[PDB]
RNA sequence: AUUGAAAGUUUUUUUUUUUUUUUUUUUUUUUUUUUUUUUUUUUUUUUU
């Protein structure tokens, strides 16, 4: 079930990728925004903002993940996949490319005085705000509670940082096919309506 | 059902301080309010 999600950053969004040829203190990924960044950020938001009636490992160590999975549910961990049990649950791909770029710099003001610290000046590469990013979340499994959890994940992504504490506003450009596919629930309809438009008009 | 897997390149840092668009520069120098015009004409200090 495809989910055509369009996200537009509300600030000077940026991520650090890398390049052998680079000079900016804060690099950028050559392709743009990778699916891994989105997936990890969404998982973090879900764990920190966990909807009622769900379980989250909230662990980085795979051994700790296994220890949490000793009981063995971790609804969030099931949605994002066991380390070595399930092949997968959902996929993220980004098609749009060719973002805008500009080099800015930042300082660190002294505390005792109000002047900039001598030698605390570093630069940062950013993506210009109000730039649209479209990515599709292909959920291949067959489960409604996990699908609702994924929708809650996307919704919570709105109230969450994405790269250098940069605010974002997620928008879903498909409600008709989502309702047509399966489980056009009233709660599902309400959350999809909430995600249908930007939080900030 | 890929040899096979699951991890946000993330956190954290105010491009800030020092500096009066300031001093000097007189809206003055010149030009007669003069110029032609008669306070003039008419009238008996006086009658029954």
Residue numbers in the entry: 2 to 202
Question: Which text from the study accompanies this structure?
Answer:
The structure of the SsoCsm complex bound to a 48 ​nt crRNA shows its architecture in unprecedented detail. We solved the SsoCsm structure at a final overall resolution of 3.52 ​Å. As the complex was purified from the native host, the bound crRNA is heterogeneous, being sampled from the over 200 spacers present in S. solfataricus P1 (Rouillon et al., 2013; Sokolowski et al., 2014), so the 40 ​nt of the spacer have been modelled as uracils. Overall, the structure is reminiscent of that of other Csm and Cmr complexes (some examples are shown in Fig. 1A), formed of two intertwined helical filaments of multiple stacked subunits wrapping around the crRNA, although SsoCsm is the tallest. Examination of the foot of the complex shows that there is almost no protein:RNA interaction for the Cas10 subunit, while Cas5 makes tight contacts with the guide RNA molecule. The final nucleotide of the 5′ handle, G8 (sometimes also known as position −1 to discriminate between the handle (−8 to −1) and spacer (1 to X) regions of the crRNA), is flipped, as seen in other type III complexes such as SisCmr (Sofos et al., 2020). The remainder of the crRNA adopts a regular pattern with every sixth nucleotide adopting a flipped orientation. Previous studies showed that SsoCsm is unusual in not cleaving at one of the flipped sites, generating a spacing of 12, 6, 6, 6 between sites (Zhang et al., 2016). The missed cleavage corresponds to the Cas7b subunit (1432; chain N in the PDB file, Fig. 3C and D), while subunits competent for RNA cleavage are Cas7a (1430, chain L in the coordinates file), Cas7c (1425, chains F and G) and Cas7d (1426, chains H and I). Analysis of the structure reveals conformational flexibility that most likely relate to target RNA capture and Cas10 activation.
